[PDB]
Amino acid sequence: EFNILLATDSYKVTHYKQYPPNTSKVYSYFECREKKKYEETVFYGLQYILNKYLKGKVVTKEKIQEAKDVYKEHFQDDVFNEKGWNYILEKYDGHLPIEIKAVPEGFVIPRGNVLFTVENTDPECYWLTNWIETILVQSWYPITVATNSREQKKILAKYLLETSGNLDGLEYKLHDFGYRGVSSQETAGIGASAHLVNFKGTDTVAGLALIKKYYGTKDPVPGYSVPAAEHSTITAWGKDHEKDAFEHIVTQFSSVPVSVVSDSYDIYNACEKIWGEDLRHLIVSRSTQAPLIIRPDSGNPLDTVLKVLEILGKKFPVTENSKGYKLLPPYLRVIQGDGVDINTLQEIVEGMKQKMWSIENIAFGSGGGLLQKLTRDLLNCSFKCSYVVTNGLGINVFKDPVADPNKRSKKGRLSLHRTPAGNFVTLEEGKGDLEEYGQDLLHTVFKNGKVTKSYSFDEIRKNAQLNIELE
Amino acid sequence: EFNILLATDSYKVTHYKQYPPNTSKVYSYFECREKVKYEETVFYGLQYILNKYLKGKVVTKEKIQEAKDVYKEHFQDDVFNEKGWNYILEKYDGHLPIEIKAVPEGFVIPRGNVLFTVENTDPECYWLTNWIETILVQSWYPITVATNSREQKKILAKYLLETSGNLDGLEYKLHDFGYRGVSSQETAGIGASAHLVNFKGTDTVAGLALIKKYYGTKDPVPGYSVPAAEHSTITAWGKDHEKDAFEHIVTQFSSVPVSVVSDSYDIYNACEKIWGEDLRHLIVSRSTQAPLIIRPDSGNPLDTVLKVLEILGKKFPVTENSKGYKLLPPYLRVIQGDGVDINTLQEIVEGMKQKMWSIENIAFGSGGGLLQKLTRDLLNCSFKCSYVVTNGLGINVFKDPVADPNKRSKKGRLSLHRTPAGNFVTLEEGKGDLEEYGQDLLHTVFKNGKVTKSYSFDEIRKNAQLNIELE
Ligand SMILES: O=C(NCc1ccc(S(=O)(=O)c2ccccc2)cc1)c1cc2cnccc2[nH]1
Ligand SMILES: O=C(NCc1ccc(S(=O)(=O)c2ccccc2)cc1)c1cc2cnccc2[nH]1
């Protein structure tokens, strides 16, 4: 079972002995710190952590004893704050005396702004605010997946609009292939849910149950997929029977969309001779609601996509759309799901544009690039103490390392506001109390063991919309 | 609750319909596919997956109904194999009719070798082998963390041996700081445990319980830490009271090791004037068993380490060890825990060596670098079908994409052997049965719902030792 007393960085066990004596309040905040790309971030994922790990009776006698036993051996010393944890158990029935205020989930906020704050609500628990730093900071992951996914949606929207004149199908242009490529089952669910803030296509099934349990949608599910082959279902037929595999699969799935990986032996032969000649009659007969989606899966991504389109364009009837770009017939599409990250995505769509191919023709799958190849450094997600009260006096505190001004932190009590021009600003040093900038955009989402404000997945999706979608 | 029917890539739900008719066996294997770095891998983490997710009754009537209901919405159609899953429920009381063979955990094996194989044990469940691809392929993560951690240990060993003449303390030279920097609590535990295959220092407490539950150690715990400050326990004292904070902290922890982050405002001032003058009397009085460990945390990692050492060397009595390298007195050490990955680690120890500083003086902390900044591409961890039986006939199968020879997969039934020179070789096409290469080194680790062979964490550590440790 999960034990919050064992869910912190080891050294934090020792911090209750290190704060100034007579400290009654420790107040800390989280930001995606500005660095001297990724100018704005999607705030998403805190509600998951609040519900799964922080709410309700999270302290018990048994959990306190288990932590005491572990830390005795881990430190080879008795340094654990048993008294402090006992107090929470006795006084609050094991509920955390903490208040967390946060910007609404889905909100899109420029770098360098307060996203949430944490403070103790009982003077005895001054040490608790930063105990939970470690678990709260893991919100960096859904924030970063959601943000990077959104930035890819911006690229797709730009190129789809330019080559087609509209945004039809945008929400299915980047499919999550990352289940096998992430570090754990839990990460899979969290990451997939973050991608679904921006798109509707996922093969990472774990995301669906997470959204249903912690957020909720009006629709039965937040994400969708369609039938498709993998290399094993082609290669199992034997090297000389690739055509037989293709025919069997597209016939099994004749009335729904189906994707067929086509590079087991020779992608170019498969497109030109197998699909383009031998089995063409099974392709040209398909419904617009049930295309074949050809999937290359190796070679230089841009070079391969362009060559595949070039081949298909000569075996199938291509049209020129009203923007002047080439368009495959509606029963035939392509998905590139190898080597796709934000950089290569951009390279591929720009390459297609240069060769006069509409982005209507293609969709992308991304796995490791979408869900695993991300770190806390990308957006400088960071949690810092900005305000303490000692001997009844509040003091504004901060770090400001001489050799790195980028690591300077904010001072005092913080609040988030709209500017007169409709942008965002974080006020420091309690200046929000002057009420010169309208209402604080941070809302209490957690207090004394209870989740106090929640958002549905639908609301989050609404908040995270692109400007171009809004327009 | 976890549901194995919902723990696969969506498209695999549709694969049972795509294999050749009358296929009775699907046999697949995992390797770290061959491409100058990472020539050998540490096999670790499958035992966790087998126990947490695959063993025992993993199919229930309720789980089948849940999956059916989810997939109907996710695919907007009825494509889920209810019959196949009901078969497993009724015939085997929901135990998976699968056999997995694997190399022992902790084993260090060159790239491009079979590490584990999977096949179904009931002809009706031919589809099951690749259903569990997704969950098994997540073994990439503990393998990759353990491997990259071990590669860092090789660097540290080389330089510690050169500069000091021995390997004392090697096992505490790379400390895990990665708890906040990984993508989930589950990942935290898995990754921390993988690092502990090589070292004993961790702040990622989640790793301890995972090891205790799934592997086991003779010792009470597999990993250790010591008291230490964070920026908040320094900055909370106020900007003008950094000295007061330092004095309080080292006095509270006067007889155990303590690390104190010293760069809140000016690391060089902190080292030269606060530690080196104002509080020097509190440092030179400490026990060899209780050093102060000074922690810089910003600036260029190499330049900052070198400058910190130069400052301390002029304020404290430095000796020259038997190798001719400079050594701080035993009550004083440094830890660099900012910007550390395998590359910067190498740069720092080489720079220290060039400046005649012993590696005895320093330890490293690594967070995102150690546990998060890794992907499945680093070692090319991959699962592929190599052998099928259809119409009673076994066929060797494989992919071999024309544009990427590096993605070619192995053919037929596989086995792992010792060569005459004592190295590893993987035999394909069932050739292990020719008995020209002695016994198969893989062991059956899972069969029909039961874990059939397992390893303690102590044995895994022994298997993963460096050659230099063995010498
Ligand atoms: O083909 C796969 N999944 C099915 C699949 C999803 C989306 C698409 S699409 O073109 O975006 C699309 C979306 C919506 C409606 C129609 C078409 C095609 C097919 C798969 C490969 C793979 C590789 N690695 C890991 C996991 C994977 N899933
Ligand atoms: O200081 C920290 N932990 C305690 C800490 C562990 C090991 C060391 S050591 O020098 O390797 C050492 C090991 C064994 C015996 C003596 C000395 C020093 C101090 C910390 C910073 C941080 C930053 N980010 C995240 C999480 C962190 N923990």
**Three-state secondary-structure class, residue A235:** helix
CA distance A217 to chain B (A): 13
Residue of B nearest to A268 (CA): B402
| Chain-chain contact of B2 with A185 (C-beta, under 8 angstroms) | yes
Closest CA to B76 of A204, A250, A256, A287: A256
| Chain-chain contact of B225 with A11 (C-beta, under 8 angstroms) | yes
Cβ of residue A222 lying under 6 Å from some atom of ligand 1: no
Residue with tokens 């704005």: A40
Report the C-alpha gap between A427 and A253 in whole angstroms: 58
Distances from the Cα of A186 to the Cα of A142, A355, B142, angstroms: 12, 41, 15
Report the C-alpha gap between B433 and B435 in whole angstroms: 5
Report the C-alpha gap between A387 and A392 in whole angstroms: 12
Residues 6+ apart with CB under 8 A from B101: B116, B117, B440, B442, B443, B444, B445
Amino acid in position A335: I
Assess contact for A92 and A447: CB atoms under 8 A: no
Distance (angstroms) between ligand 1 centre and the Cα of A367 equals 11
- The closest CB to that of B186, out of A12, A185, A377, belongs to A185
Pairing status of strand A443-447 against strand A98-102: antiparallel
Experimental method: X-ray
Rg (CA), chain A: 26
The pair of structure tokens assigned to B206 is 């989640």
In this structure, the number of other CB atoms found within 10 A of the CB of residue A277 comes to 10
Residue with tokens 């690229």: A155
Q: Does B62 touch chain A (CB under 8 A)?
A: no
Residue with tokens 């009537």: B61
Domain boundaries, chain B: 1-137+376-454, 138-375+455-471
- The closest CB to that of B183, out of A191, A226, A388, belongs to A191
Assess contact for B97 and B128: CB atoms under 8 A: yes
Report the C-alpha gap between A150 and A464 in whole angstroms: 8
Residue with tokens 């699909």: A275
The pair of structure tokens assigned to B446 is 């899972």
DSSP letter assigned to residue A428 = P
Q: Which fold has domain A138-375+455-471?
A: TIM Barrel (3.20.20)
Instruction: Provide the greatest CA pair distance for chain A.
Output: 84
Query: Residue A253 pairs with which residues in a beta bridge?
Result: none
Amino acid in position A227: P
Q: Does A51 touch chain B (CB under 8 A)?
A: no
Resolution in A: 1.6
Query: Residue B357 pairs with which residues in a beta bridge?
Result: B326
Report the C-alpha gap between A188 and B186 in whole angstroms: 10
Residue with tokens 């993993």: B58
**Measuring from atom 9 of ligand 2, which residue has the nearest CA?**
B363
Q: Is the Cα dihedral A117, A121, A127, A131 positive or negative? A: negative
Mutate to test the interface with A, among B3, B4, B8, B10 (most CBs of A within 10 A): B10
Residue with tokens 């004893």: A65
Q: Ligand 2, residue B335: give the atom nearest the CA.
A: 10
- The DSSP-derived string for A109-135 is EETTSEEEEEEESSGGGTTHHHHTHHH
- The closest CB to that of A236, out of B224, B237, B397, belongs to B397
CA-angle at B452, arms to B448 and B454, nearest 5°: 140
Q: Does A306 touch chain B (CB under 8 A)?
A: no
Residues 6+ apart with CB under 8 A from B265: A399, A400, A401, A402, B239, B242
Report the C-alpha gap between B450 and B51 in whole angstroms: 9
Which of A11, A71, A77, A138, when mutated, tests ligand 2's pocket best, judged by the most ligand atoms within 8 Å of its CB? A11
CA distance B279 to chain A (A): 17
- The closest CB to that of B397, out of A133, A209, A235, belongs to A235
Residue with tokens 């989810």: B70
Closest CA to B136 of B174, B96, B172: B96
Report the C-alpha gap between B244 and B295 in whole angstroms: 17
Query: Residue B333 pairs with which residues in a beta bridge?
Result: B293
The pair of structure tokens assigned to A147 is 């943000």
**Three-state secondary-structure class, residue A17:** helix
- The closest CB to that of A180, out of B73, B138, B190, belongs to B138
The pair of structure tokens assigned to B328 is 């701080």
- B86, exposed or middle or buried, with CB in 10 Å at 0-12, 13-18, 19+? middle
Residue of B nearest to A204 (CA): B9
CA A70, distance to chain mean position in Å, is 33
Q: Does A437 touch chain B (CB under 8 A)?
A: no
Residue A337, annotated ligand binder?
A: yes
| Chain-chain contact of A9 with B229 (C-beta, under 8 angstroms) | no
Cβ of residue A203 lying under 6 Å from some atom of ligand 1: yes
| Chain-chain contact of B235 with A368 (C-beta, under 8 angstroms) | no
Give me the total of CB pairs closer than 8 Å, taking one residue from chain A and one from chain B.
333
Interface of A with B in 2-31 (CB under 8 A): 2, 6-12, 14-15, 17-20, 23, 26, 28
Q: Is the Cα dihedral B192, B195, B196, B201 positive or negative? A: negative
H, E, C per residue of chain B: CCCHHHCCEHHHHHHHHCCCCCEEEEEEEEEECCCCCCCEEECCCHHHHHHHHHCCCCCCHHHHHHHHHHHHHHHCCCCCCHHHHHHHHHHHCCCCCEEEEECCCCCEEECCCEEEEEEECCHHHCCHHHHCHHHHHCCHHHHHHHHHHHHHHHHHHHHHHHHHCCCCCHHHCEEECCCCCCCCHHHHHHHHHHHCCCCCEECECHHHHHHHHHCCCCCCCCCECCCECCHHHHHCCCHHHHHHHHHHHHHHCCCCCEEEECCCCCHHHHHHHHHHHHCHHHHCCCCCCCCEEEECCCCCHHHHHHHHHHHHHHHCCCEECCCCCEECCCCEEEEECCCCCHHHHHHHHHHHHHCCECHHHEEEEECHHHHCCCCCCCCCEEEEEEEEEECCEEEECCCCCCCCHHHCCCCCCCEEEECCCCCEEEECCCHHHHCCCCCCCCEEEEECCEECCCCCHHHHHHHCCCHHHHC
Distance (angstroms) between ligand 2 centre and the Cα of B311 equals 21
Assess contact for B155 and B348: CB atoms under 8 A: no
Distances from the Cα of B428 to the Cα of A146, A238, B431, angstroms: 43, 16, 6
- Indicate the helix (H) or strand (E) that contains A248: helix A242-252
Using an 8 Å CB-CB cutoff, list chain A residues near B377: 368
CA distance B182 to chain A (A): 7
| Chain-chain contact of B15 with A388 (C-beta, under 8 angstroms) | no
Q: Residue A295: nearest ligand to its CA?
A: 1
Residue with tokens 């296929």: B23
Residues 6+ apart with CB under 8 A from B356: B324, B325, B326
**Three-state secondary-structure class, residue A390:** strand
Distance (angstroms) between ligand 1 centre and the Cα of B264 equals 49
Amino acid in position A289: Q
Closest CA to A145 of A203, A79, A195, A213: A195
Report the C-alpha gap between A56 and B369 in whole angstroms: 34
Pairing status of strand A326-327 against strand A332-336: unpaired
